[PDB]
């Protein structure tokens, strides 16, 4: 920068730290589930992977965005509260 203290040196470091053991989930929304499975029925992680809504060899978490009308007994890890409520309202089951 010509000799004055550069932008990347006059500014402070971003605070905090990074978690070495953080667990990451591949997420999917109930709206997506409803769009992919209009007929309902039991739905699993491998079915999600096959339909291409989620990555393979990854933990799957279901989120509660969108609307759901089909009755689906989905199985995943670590559901969200809203997604669980929507599943049980539509009449399916949300099991880990």
């Amino acid at each position: 920068e010509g000799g004055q203290m550069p932008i990347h040196m006059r500014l402070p470091k971003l605070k905090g730290f990074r978690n070495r053991f953080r667990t990451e989930y591949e997420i999917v929304n109930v709206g997506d589930i409803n769009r992919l499975f209009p007929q309902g029925g039991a739905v699993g992680v491998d079915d999600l992977v096959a339909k291409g809504a989620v990555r393979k060899n990854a933990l799957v978490k279901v989120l509660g965005d969108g609307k759901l009308t089909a009755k689906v007994d989905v199985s995943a890890h670590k559901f969200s509260g809203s997604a669980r409520a929507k599943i049980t309202a539509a009449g399916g089951s949300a099991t880990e």
Binding site: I7, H8, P12, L14
Partner: protein, 62 residues
């Protein structure tokens, strides 16, 4: 040869969910006795990078 990123730039900048680059503000590490709480509240938090420095910051981060 793979391109290398700048270490200090990566420690001082980060991107948001839509692609903006944000930073923290200076003058907030020590000598805080004489600074009013209004000044410290203004200095608190994160802010977006100026449109004049965005090009150089992007080049540093990439």
């Amino acid at each position: 040869p793979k391109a290398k990123t700048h270490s200090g730039a990566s420690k001082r900048f980060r991107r948001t969910g839509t692609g903006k680059i944000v930073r923290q503000k200076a003058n907030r590490r020590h000598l805080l006795e004489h600074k009013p709480s209004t000044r410290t509240r203004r200095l608190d938090g994160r802010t977006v990078v100026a449109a004049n420095d965005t090009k150089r910051v992007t080049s540093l981060l990439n």
